[PDB]
Each structure stands twice: as structure tokens, then as C-alpha cells.
DNA sequence: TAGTA
DNA sequence: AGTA
């Protein structure tokens, strides 16, 4: 038990009016698919006045009825709907009932933006305000500020989050900037709004003879909107959406905007000071009481004992000291670039196996996926020759492409590890890990974790980066202390999540000759918790207990020590079954226990220990 | 069997197309806002219509036979809630050749549309698309049966109009679903919109008040139609929960006042003289043809007659020569092996049905081979335990499972087969209501079970084009993303397997599915025969567009594997009648350079047979050779 | 089949 | 909140 500072700040409690927002019913025309309703009301909230937000399938507003735009239209994905709001008088909400308070926070959050607008002599993009300018150049003008956020606490009061930030601003414009010449970037942005894209390559075609699906020209599309009012920037550029990147879509460099002395980033003490400042400065135009730094009781997590042949501090050092369990191994390499094995990889593997007195064979893959039958053939031969797992050096492939390859391998019963080829040696973190995986998948128990945890099976699900398992998905899973399992991949989202877990569960009944008593499921919060409904219902019919935990890297906030320094692994409890996890300024992991009858500390310890060994 | 037999098709030849119709007007279209690329074709079909006249979709534009001045060059559209605006750009006249499979398909679309336009302007007669219903046959309160014929009009590779005619009857309802139900008639299966021809699956009625039932975004269900002026002159009635039926699981609301029950022969009752004997059918199709012919103005209909060859019957043989596959069950299999079969009873009891145990015990006895008749005492697919009982069974040597189960949805059927095949257990379905004296169904089911078990029941004579033939199926679905199954036959009976797309991840490109299904069959064939097949026969369902096999074909080419891609359609094959005398069983009727019919009566059918239309799309093999192999594969299984 | 409710 |  220790005391810590969170980058939050309590403000005044909400008054009785704010706890009793106005509600509004909505009618749309034409009626959209029920799955589209919610994103649309959110849009309806913007169309309407300000400090108004979506509530249920209606709206909730903090501002007077006579200020909202009760009628109009909104366009979404090219389609246009007519909306109409209907007042129905104030409705009370409890800050204490997750649901209702989601609204209050949404309201709270919209307000901040509304208040952030009025502030002048400073520019605000969304919730990110910017005071002092950090640089100035022919096009770049790095400003200094912080990303903000405002919400409601279970107490029923305001809560401000503050965190120092940068912003590389380009006032040049793609074509121009690409014009007095620079190398095209990876991610670009438009000129008419805030939506960002990933630059795929550049337009070798004519932007007026290049027709979109309808048959409309790329130029006419934008021209007939007002975006071409003599803003000629008119070179063609092939862009792609941050979501689902091959489907590539055409755009215009002249209607885009890209993304040596140095303020990279300040220390901990400096940032926690710069943050405590803005809380005072922003508390100025906020007029919501006087900021109060939030103290949170943080618990000290136990450092786990790892065992290779001899004690070891990290799994990586097992590659020099030796593995916990050894066996005669055969590992083949598949190269999707050039040649044989890079020297430092052959070396370590030899070193590590020497140090374990185990025999090691190193094959090399005689084929490439593009030869059809031959490939499958090669894999079977290699599988026959004792190959127990495959290492794959390869240029960066799309999520979809690798899953596919691991499947051609998996069908020839070949576990695999994918090491991206522009191999950066000096990046040991990377390749030392790639090898641990390869070894774990080959069946080697590199390190043993001395334990005391509820889950004998922890499976983590992957959807790439999508907010859904619609387009198939993938799962990785370990048998508790040391038993990396047969990681899988697989229509309807619920049915997807379930097969993933069905197979893994099955792999484990294969190894342990018994079903796991309990399972720990880890997933990204970006995916609706409901997609797991079927898997959980399935686990129940089996009697398999479980705990469902949502994960989210960025968005945790910040943790600062009172006066000393922060320990290696920390556990910070929060508002209702939510808690932070901090390891080794650092970035916390925000976690949520959405289902399961297991204490948060137990869970915290098991995730942390799972984190310790990559 | 080599003799030729003249035969009359229910087709008729019309004047050749004049130069003008060989050079339709072409028009470029443009849509705003740009829709998803997968909506462009469905939308152009809509533009073709909005534009009016005899105009059809051609590529990414239109093609028309009516004067360009008659078209509606500008208008709006709506496709599933979403709406867009279109503008046409007349780009002159452009020639098409009947010899080219693609261009000919377009000219025929124009013809089909021509038939529609002429039918739509007919006096006192009833039209339901390409169908015409001329006269009454019975009526009674609110309903009325009409008899006419569904028709078709297309162009040939020769370049002349061809008219198809087949008598049909239609039962029309003269009132609303509200009226009909008010007067006591039962709940029909399917309902049609009153304001258009869209139909639906009626699920049930609802107690909710239309006036206050809210559609997704909040609009009342009543205001939805009310505003669309569909209410003018009607009564909304009560709420009717309806289904797509392409999305049979999701209910949408509707209203009885705006619905018209789609009546069936059952609904009416009151043995109502509706069924046409082959003789009466034939004279009626000639009579209607004469009729539509005068109204069509495309010359006089000359019934098309063709040469129908009787294909050579296959030298079938198990342990010794045989007249039919099921005979091997008692004379012994062509080539036996130790065999293990497990029976999975999803109906209600315990074992092997006495008559099934007998045939099997006897079949193997005649073959002189060891057999084990297992029984899965594992419950239906309920639990990871089931997955376990299966793994155990395969480990213990089972080679195939016989599933005795009540009829399954074909989704649930493919699921189960997927579970089992997983664990390496092939399968054969046999629907539960089974009775001793139903020799035809179960003797065959037993043959599939054995063929799948790796057991070669019967072998076909010899010398066929392909030594490996694989069929593809997407079950109704017009593409191989959403599902995909394939069955491979070792050519001359060496039965290979059954399978479907393994487990990969992410959106799937059809060409990759198709490729993988074949990819698997080749390995099956590999392991089971020692080498890759020299030539393969790929049979696909016509509903699907052949573009999806491109990757697959290029792969075979790369591999050094020859092929022939033939597409099958049990629909629109027309009819076939004798000119005189009666008609045999396995007939081969070639029609064009690359198309033929295949007929097969059996028992002695009083009705008329619907032949199978087959189209040779890729390949070098003669049609006759291809018809033999397919025909022989059909009987064998 | 051109066309949610 | 807002395809190209």
C-alpha cells in the first residue's frame, strides 16, 4: 500500500439542474438500419444546439431548450436524413449507476469543448488545447499544450484530466510541401476537416478522367462541394482508410496535408509540474471550482520468480543461461525476402541450446507461398523431417496476409513466429522475443513461472485493429505457468469469438487431458463486450468458470509518486471494477473486469505476471 | 445405344434480329453520390428501368433498343433505404456479336425486356413479370385461379429470337390480408406488398398499435407508409410481423391493410383439377405460343426440334458385373477393406435399425471383409464431450459416420458435417422417417457412407476425359465467400472427398475460396492415388458468375493440369417432348456449340421432366464426351 | 425481378 | 459528425 497522484483534478459538485438534464426524443427520416441509429443520434447531437448529447435513443441536454436547433438534416456516408427533436422536460440521472453517468460524463465532456471554444489567443483541436508555441519553420510550427478531458465521478462532481502534449502542425499543404520537395509521409490528412488517412502511394492518373464507383470523376466529386473553389492543389494521390487498408481509395494531394533541434519529451518531475500548472490555468476559463489533485491508493505487486535452468530476471536471459525444460528441437526458417539464417540468430539459438545441453537442428524453407502446390508440399516434407516450428523473416505484411500464411502452416501442423525482415539487430528487445515465441511454440518450456493464480488458461483475442470480430479474428493462449498453446484463427462476430475459444479450450484438453477449471479472457475494449456473449454462454454449459477483462493501452491517464519513486509493478484500483496496472514518464494499462467472480488483486497479479513474460 | 431420336423442345424460332437490333444504343451513366462498388450493378438495373423504354444494363452503362429520345435521362433511385441521383450520357450505337457469350447475354436481356414491354401493353390479361395469365379456372370469394404460361425471349449464337413457353397457373387473392383474415381464412405462408410485387414470409400478427410502433430511427410504422401515400384509399389494419426471406431470422414490421396474401393450392382446397398431363401440357404450350406470337410481331413461332442422343449405359461392376450400384450390396463391393462405421442417432433411440445392420453384415460378408458397426453413445452435438466422443471414435478406427436425423436446415447440415470432418470423420445424412420398404433412399445412403469410408463400392468401365471430377456448391448463395463446399470423385468411381474452406482469417476473396476447395481435393487425390490428376472436370452451379474460378483455372494451368469447366442449372432448361412415340431415360440433347440438356425419367412419370441445362464454359473436350462423364457420375451417386 | 419496415 |  502506497499513495500516488493521478493526472486528474476534482472540481465542484454538479448542481441540481445539471443532475436533471433536458431530454429530447428524435425521429429520423428515412429510418436507418437499427445498427446505424446510435452513430446517427450522436450526429444529431452535433446538429442540435451545444452541450447536448445522445441518451438512450434520444438526447440529453445541459443547455436551455430554446437554444437547440430542433430541425434539419444531416449527411452520413453520402446519405442524408431529416431529423426532428421533441422536448419532454428534465429527467434526473444518478451519478452512480454506470449507465446514467455515461451521459453525465458525455455532457461534462461536451461542455468542456463548448467552453474550450470561447478561450482565445490559443487554438483548440477537439479537446487538445495549445498555449505556447514550441517551434516555427517553413511549414512546421510545433505548438505546446495538453490533451484534456472532463467527466463525472461517482460522487457526482466534475473531474478534470490533464496531460502535457505536442502537435506537429503543417501549414504547407501536401502538394506544396511535397513540392518544394520532401519524402511523402505514411499518414496524411485532408484540408476540409479533421479526418486522417494513410498515404498509400501517389496518383499516376488524371484527376478528372479518373471515375469513382458511381462513375463520377474524382475531381467533380470534390468540385461540386465547394472544396475546389480555386484551391487547385490538383495532383492525384492514392490514399487508404486507417481502418481496413488494402481497399484503397483515391484522393487529391492538393486537398490533403501531411502529418532539426529538439524537444522530444521532458522527464517525469517536469511533466507532473507542467500538468499541475495547466490544471490551474484551465481551471480559469472553466469556472467549475478550484482544481484538487487526486490521490489514489496504489498497491505494491509482487515480483514473480522466473526459472530457466538457473534463476533468471527476464525470460530473455534464458537464452544465455538455459531453458527450464529442454528437448531435441528442429526449427525451419522461411524467408520472404532474400536468403540461410542471419548470423546473430543462428548464434543465439546455438548458444541457448548449448547452454541447455539440448540438440538443435536448423533447416531452411525451400519454397514460397506463390508456387501453389509446391509450398504445401515443402511444408509437409519439412514437417516430416522433424521441423517443429517455423520462423518467418518477412517484409511487413498486412494482418490479413499473415493470418493466412500461419494457416497454410497450421494445416501442415506447423506453429510459427513472424519476425519482420528489415531486421534491426540493435533491437534485441524484438528478436530475442521472436525467438522465445518460436521456442515456446516448438514446445520448449523456456521459463517457468512460480504461481498462485485462478486461471489455468489465459487466452487473448485479436481482431487486428478493428472494433469488431466480423472479419474473422485470431487468438493466442498460454497454459498458466508455462504452456504456450496452439494459437488459432477463424462470419458472425459472436460465432467467431467462440470458435477461437473453442479451439484453444480444445488444445488445452489435449495437453492437460482435462478441461480448465477457470479461464481468463483478455480483449481490447475497442470491441463491444457483447461479441463475447456466446463464448461465455458456452463456457457456462461446460461449467468452466471465467473472468472477462477489457484492456486498453492509451487512455489510462498518468501516475506520479508522492515523493519517492514508483516500484516495478503497481496496482491502482479505481471506479468500480476498473483499475490501472503500471510496470517499470510511463504509460499505464487501464483494465476492466466485466465478468467473473474473482478479486481484482488476483486478476491484477495474473495479468501482470503474464506481462512479465512476453 | 447410339441411335438418334428427333425431339421437340418447348422453344420456338422467330425472325432473325435486323441490323438495328444488332447495334443497340449505348449510354454512359453516372451516380451521385458514388455508392459502394458492390452496389453499382444492382443500381444500374434500377436505372435501366427508371429510364424506361427497352433498355438494359451493359457493363457499367446501358444499352437500349428504343429511340434515345424516349428515355428518361435523369432521375432518382433508392436501394435499401439509401437514395441516389443518376444522369445518362448518350454515346451512340454500338455493335454486339451473338457468337460472344457475354455480348449475346446482353442482346438477350434486351429481348427479355422487349417481351416484358409488349406483355405490359396487352389488353385484358394478367401479367406477373414474364408470365401471362389469360383465363380463369375457378374463383369463389376473393380468390381466383388463372392459367397462362411463364415465358422467355432471348437471342441465339445464330442471331435470331428464340421464345420459350411453359404453361403455369396462378392463384390470385382479390383482397387485403386484413380482409382475408377478417373473413376467417387461415394465416398464409407468404405475403406480397399491395403497392408493389415484393413478397415476404409471414411470421405472425402483432398486438402493437401501428400508430405508435416506432421504426428504427423513431418514425412511426404508420407514418412511414402514410407519408408514402400508400395509405390513400386504404385501411392500415393490424400490425404484421414479416420476414425477408433472404434474412429469414430477422422480423420487420408491416401492416395487414397494405398486404395481399400469396395463396397456395392448399389454402384454397374446397383435388381442384390443377395438374397437367404431358399430352395436355404440350398442346397448351403450342396454343399459347401461337397466341403470344401474334401479339409479338416477330414472325411466326416455329417449334424447335432437336436430335436427342441416347448415351451409352455404364459398365458398372462390384465384385462381379452389376446392373446397378445397390446390387453391390448383395453381390459384394468392387474393392473392399477393413471397415469401421459408427451410427449417430439424433432422433431418439439406440441402435442400428435391424434392416440396416442386415444389409451391411451381408454386404461385407459377400465381399469377404471385416466390418465393425459402432454406435455413438454421445448425445447430439451437445458439449465439448461430443467433440470428445468423436475424437475417441476416430482414434478407435471409425472411418465414417451415418447420421440418422430429422430434416436439417442446410446450415445446420453443413455445420454438423464441419464438426465431424474436423476430427477426420466423413459423413452421410439419412433423414429419420425411415421404413423397411424404402429400399431406394437407404441403399444409396449406405453407398455414400461406404464410398466416403474409403471403400470402393463400384467401379465404372473406363476411359473418361477427367480422372478427377469435382463439383462445387455455394447452396443458393450467388458467390463462394459465404460458404463453399466441394465433393471430389476419383473418376471412374475411386471416390475422393468432401470438404469446405479450411479456417483462415479476414474477409475472403471468392477466387481464393474456390481455389482452396480444389487445392484440398488435389491433395486428397494425391495421397489416395500417388500423383496429381492429369485432367480435372470442374462442375459449378450456374447461378454463380464464372469469374470466381479464374484464379483456380490459372493455378491448374501453372500446375500442368488440364481442365474443363462446366456449369449446371436445373432451372430454365425448358421442356422436351417426343415428336412421336415415347421418351427414354438418359438422353443427351445438344443445343448449341457449348450447351446441352440431359434428361432422365424413371418409374413412369406421368408429368413432364425438367431437364438439366449444362454449359461448357472452359475446356477443349468434346461436348458428347463431357455429357457422358457427367451423366455417368449422376447415376453412380 | 427496382423499389424495408 | 462529416468517403473518395
XYZ file of N, CA and C in Angstrom, chain B residues 360-466:
321
model
N -25.603 -54.266 -44.271
C -24.189 -54.078 -44.062
C -23.481 -55.414 -43.806
N -23.986 -56.196 -42.843
C -23.400 -57.507 -42.498
C -23.359 -58.414 -43.685
N -24.376 -58.278 -44.490
C -24.423 -59.095 -45.636
C -23.529 -58.591 -46.742
N -23.490 -57.276 -46.912
C -22.653 -56.702 -47.949
C -21.202 -57.102 -47.709
N -20.721 -56.907 -46.487
C -19.335 -57.267 -46.215
C -19.106 -58.751 -46.268
N -20.127 -59.533 -45.923
C -19.989 -60.975 -45.982
C -19.728 -61.380 -47.422
N -20.469 -60.780 -48.347
C -20.313 -61.107 -49.764
C -18.986 -60.624 -50.325
N -18.397 -59.647 -49.651
C -17.127 -59.077 -50.074
C -15.976 -59.817 -49.413
N -16.243 -60.413 -48.260
C -15.205 -61.136 -47.559
C -14.291 -60.163 -46.843
N -14.892 -59.255 -46.086
C -14.136 -58.251 -45.387
C -14.672 -57.985 -43.996
N -13.775 -57.505 -43.142
C -14.085 -57.213 -41.759
C -14.787 -55.869 -41.617
N -15.851 -55.864 -40.823
C -16.639 -54.682 -40.575
C -16.946 -54.515 -39.105
N -16.961 -53.271 -38.636
C -17.327 -53.004 -37.252
C -18.478 -52.026 -37.275
N -19.567 -52.357 -36.594
C -20.736 -51.491 -36.532
C -20.796 -50.774 -35.190
N -20.080 -49.661 -35.113
C -20.022 -48.851 -33.899
C -21.342 -48.120 -33.673
N -21.443 -47.436 -32.545
C -22.614 -46.654 -32.192
C -22.171 -45.496 -31.294
N -22.438 -44.260 -31.696
C -22.029 -43.144 -30.863
C -23.020 -42.897 -29.744
N -22.649 -43.312 -28.534
C -23.496 -43.113 -27.360
C -23.247 -41.705 -26.828
N -22.870 -40.815 -27.736
C -22.626 -39.430 -27.389
C -23.910 -38.735 -27.765
N -24.342 -37.806 -26.927
C -25.580 -37.087 -27.184
C -25.462 -36.303 -28.480
N -26.533 -35.586 -28.877
C -26.439 -34.811 -30.116
C -25.217 -33.919 -29.937
N -24.901 -33.089 -30.917
C -23.750 -32.221 -30.736
C -23.987 -31.286 -29.545
N -23.907 -31.821 -28.331
C -24.125 -31.010 -27.140
C -23.038 -31.124 -26.066
N -21.976 -30.348 -26.249
C -20.895 -30.347 -25.292
C -19.556 -30.584 -25.941
N -18.492 -30.205 -25.249
C -17.172 -30.444 -25.782
C -17.005 -31.952 -25.660
N -17.890 -32.561 -24.876
C -17.886 -34.003 -24.671
C -18.142 -34.703 -26.008
N -19.034 -34.126 -26.817
C -19.360 -34.666 -28.139
C -18.074 -34.651 -28.964
N -17.413 -33.501 -29.000
C -16.155 -33.363 -29.721
C -15.228 -34.498 -29.252
N -15.354 -34.864 -27.973
C -14.534 -35.902 -27.348
C -14.937 -37.301 -27.790
N -16.234 -37.586 -27.782
C -16.724 -38.892 -28.206
C -16.301 -39.183 -29.650
N -16.221 -38.126 -30.453
C -15.837 -38.232 -31.846
C -14.366 -38.543 -31.975
N -13.538 -37.772 -31.280
C -12.091 -37.964 -31.322
C -11.774 -39.406 -30.947
N -12.454 -39.886 -29.912
C -12.292 -41.248 -29.422
C -12.620 -42.244 -30.540
N -13.774 -42.056 -31.174
C -14.238 -42.910 -32.267
C -13.268 -43.005 -33.455
N -12.662 -41.884 -33.820
C -11.748 -41.859 -34.946
C -10.462 -42.553 -34.557
N -10.103 -42.404 -33.290
C -8.885 -42.993 -32.766
C -9.079 -44.497 -32.754
N -10.281 -44.915 -32.384
C -10.628 -46.320 -32.331
C -10.818 -46.934 -33.714
N -10.587 -46.157 -34.764
C -10.726 -46.690 -36.113
C -11.975 -46.421 -36.947
N -12.921 -45.626 -36.460
C -14.102 -45.338 -37.262
C -13.652 -44.564 -38.488
N -14.299 -44.807 -39.620
C -13.920 -44.166 -40.870
C -15.005 -43.277 -41.473
N -16.208 -43.343 -40.928
C -17.294 -42.534 -41.449
C -18.441 -42.711 -40.515
N -19.308 -41.716 -40.456
C -20.443 -41.777 -39.563
C -21.738 -41.649 -40.347
N -22.726 -42.431 -39.934
C -24.035 -42.435 -40.542
C -24.899 -41.638 -39.588
N -25.473 -40.547 -40.078
C -26.307 -39.721 -39.232
C -27.777 -39.896 -39.555
N -28.505 -40.475 -38.600
C -29.946 -40.703 -38.704
C -30.545 -39.504 -37.988
N -31.063 -38.558 -38.759
C -31.587 -37.337 -38.176
C -32.777 -36.731 -38.903
N -33.680 -36.084 -38.151
C -34.854 -35.442 -38.741
C -34.299 -34.405 -39.703
N -35.083 -33.994 -40.701
C -34.569 -32.996 -41.644
C -33.895 -31.792 -40.982
N -32.741 -31.417 -41.520
C -31.971 -30.293 -41.000
C -31.944 -29.140 -41.993
N -31.761 -27.931 -41.470
C -31.670 -26.742 -42.308
C -30.371 -26.957 -43.034
N -30.215 -26.463 -44.232
C -28.960 -26.834 -44.779
C -27.767 -26.137 -44.084
N -28.053 -25.207 -43.181
C -26.980 -24.521 -42.478
C -26.554 -25.486 -41.394
N -27.520 -25.972 -40.624
C -27.230 -26.929 -39.554
C -26.597 -28.229 -40.084
N -26.846 -28.536 -41.351
C -26.332 -29.737 -42.008
C -24.868 -29.560 -42.331
N -24.537 -28.383 -42.820
C -23.171 -28.102 -43.142
C -22.335 -27.886 -41.891
N -22.993 -27.426 -40.834
C -22.295 -27.211 -39.575
C -21.838 -28.573 -39.042
N -22.802 -29.462 -38.815
C -22.515 -30.802 -38.312
C -21.428 -31.505 -39.125
N -21.560 -31.487 -40.444
C -20.562 -32.120 -41.292
C -19.209 -31.492 -41.053
N -19.215 -30.214 -40.683
C -17.978 -29.484 -40.425
C -17.344 -29.934 -39.118
N -18.175 -30.142 -38.104
C -17.678 -30.585 -36.814
C -16.945 -31.923 -36.978
N -17.647 -32.902 -37.548
C -17.120 -34.245 -37.772
C -15.866 -34.323 -38.625
N -15.921 -33.723 -39.818
C -14.804 -33.734 -40.775
C -13.576 -33.172 -40.124
N -13.835 -32.422 -39.077
C -12.794 -31.802 -38.334
C -11.894 -32.819 -37.765
N -12.580 -33.695 -37.063
C -11.999 -34.793 -36.360
C -11.640 -35.899 -37.332
N -11.780 -35.600 -38.619
C -11.464 -36.571 -39.654
C -12.549 -37.587 -39.979
N -13.783 -37.336 -39.544
C -14.879 -38.267 -39.786
C -15.872 -37.919 -40.906
N -15.699 -38.509 -42.109
C -16.635 -38.213 -43.197
C -18.061 -38.506 -42.741
N -19.059 -38.121 -43.522
C -20.429 -38.333 -43.067
C -21.482 -38.457 -44.169
N -22.604 -39.064 -43.807
C -23.705 -39.288 -44.726
C -25.000 -39.124 -43.960
N -25.867 -38.252 -44.459
C -27.146 -37.989 -43.818
C -28.214 -38.944 -44.326
N -29.143 -39.286 -43.444
C -30.238 -40.178 -43.783
C -31.380 -39.738 -42.873
N -32.336 -39.004 -43.448
C -33.480 -38.457 -42.702
C -34.307 -39.510 -41.991
N -34.557 -39.252 -40.708
C -35.245 -40.154 -39.784
C -36.521 -40.949 -40.136
N -37.561 -40.321 -40.733
C -38.732 -41.167 -41.036
C -38.275 -42.238 -42.025
N -37.900 -43.402 -41.511
C -37.416 -44.465 -42.376
C -38.178 -45.748 -42.129
N -38.551 -46.403 -43.223
C -39.302 -47.645 -43.154
C -38.673 -48.732 -44.008
N -38.654 -49.948 -43.469
C -38.096 -51.109 -44.156
C -38.179 -51.021 -45.681
N -39.402 -51.004 -46.198
C -39.628 -50.977 -47.639
C -39.341 -49.662 -48.382
N -38.290 -48.942 -47.999
C -37.938 -47.696 -48.687
C -36.574 -47.878 -49.341
N -36.380 -49.089 -49.847
C -35.151 -49.531 -50.495
C -34.342 -48.519 -51.303
N -34.990 -47.628 -52.036
C -34.212 -46.699 -52.833
C -33.361 -45.687 -52.050
N -33.966 -44.998 -51.094
C -33.226 -43.993 -50.348
C -32.080 -44.551 -49.502
N -32.377 -45.498 -48.620
C -31.326 -46.021 -47.768
C -30.228 -46.851 -48.438
N -30.528 -47.563 -49.520
C -29.474 -48.331 -50.178
C -28.432 -47.356 -50.718
N -28.889 -46.195 -51.159
C -27.957 -45.210 -51.670
C -27.213 -44.562 -50.491
N -27.945 -44.154 -49.455
C -27.308 -43.541 -48.295
C -26.157 -44.439 -47.848
N -26.422 -45.745 -47.817
C -25.432 -46.730 -47.415
C -24.256 -46.728 -48.367
N -24.511 -46.442 -49.637
C -23.419 -46.401 -50.600
C -22.515 -45.178 -50.389
N -23.114 -44.038 -50.041
C -22.320 -42.840 -49.816
C -21.448 -42.984 -48.582
N -22.042 -43.569 -47.547
C -21.355 -43.810 -46.299
C -20.109 -44.658 -46.596
N -20.283 -45.709 -47.395
C -19.174 -46.606 -47.714
C -18.145 -45.992 -48.641
N -18.618 -45.279 -49.655
C -17.720 -44.626 -50.602
C -16.834 -43.638 -49.847
N -17.429 -42.958 -48.869
C -16.716 -41.986 -48.052
C -15.765 -42.669 -47.087
N -16.146 -43.851 -46.623
C -15.312 -44.589 -45.698
C -14.009 -45.028 -46.347
N -13.834 -44.710 -47.621
C -12.623 -45.104 -48.322
C -12.853 -46.427 -49.031
N -14.093 -46.881 -48.962
C -14.463 -48.128 -49.569
C -14.999 -47.939 -50.990
N -14.383 -48.619 -51.949
C -14.791 -48.530 -53.346
C -15.856 -49.553 -53.766
N -17.103 -49.204 -53.471
C -18.283 -49.995 -53.781
C -18.371 -50.501 -55.215
N -18.347 -49.567 -56.158
C -18.441 -49.881 -57.574
C -17.419 -49.115 -58.377
N -17.032 -49.676 -59.513
C -16.081 -49.030 -60.402
C -16.727 -48.905 -61.788
N -16.497 -47.777 -62.456
C -17.061 -47.547 -63.781
C -16.092 -48.075 -64.832
N -16.642 -48.612 -65.926
C -15.873 -49.194 -67.040
C -14.510 -48.562 -67.224
N -14.449 -47.468 -67.979
C -13.176 -46.792 -68.163
C -13.140 -45.736 -69.248
N -11.965 -45.135 -69.411
C -11.720 -44.126 -70.438
C -12.632 -42.897 -70.449
N -12.399 -41.987 -69.509
C -13.163 -40.751 -69.453
C -12.189 -39.579 -69.560
N -12.691 -38.391 -69.934
C -11.806 -37.232 -70.050
C -11.010 -36.935 -68.767
N -11.716 -36.694 -67.667
C -11.060 -36.389 -66.403
C -10.876 -37.628 -65.522
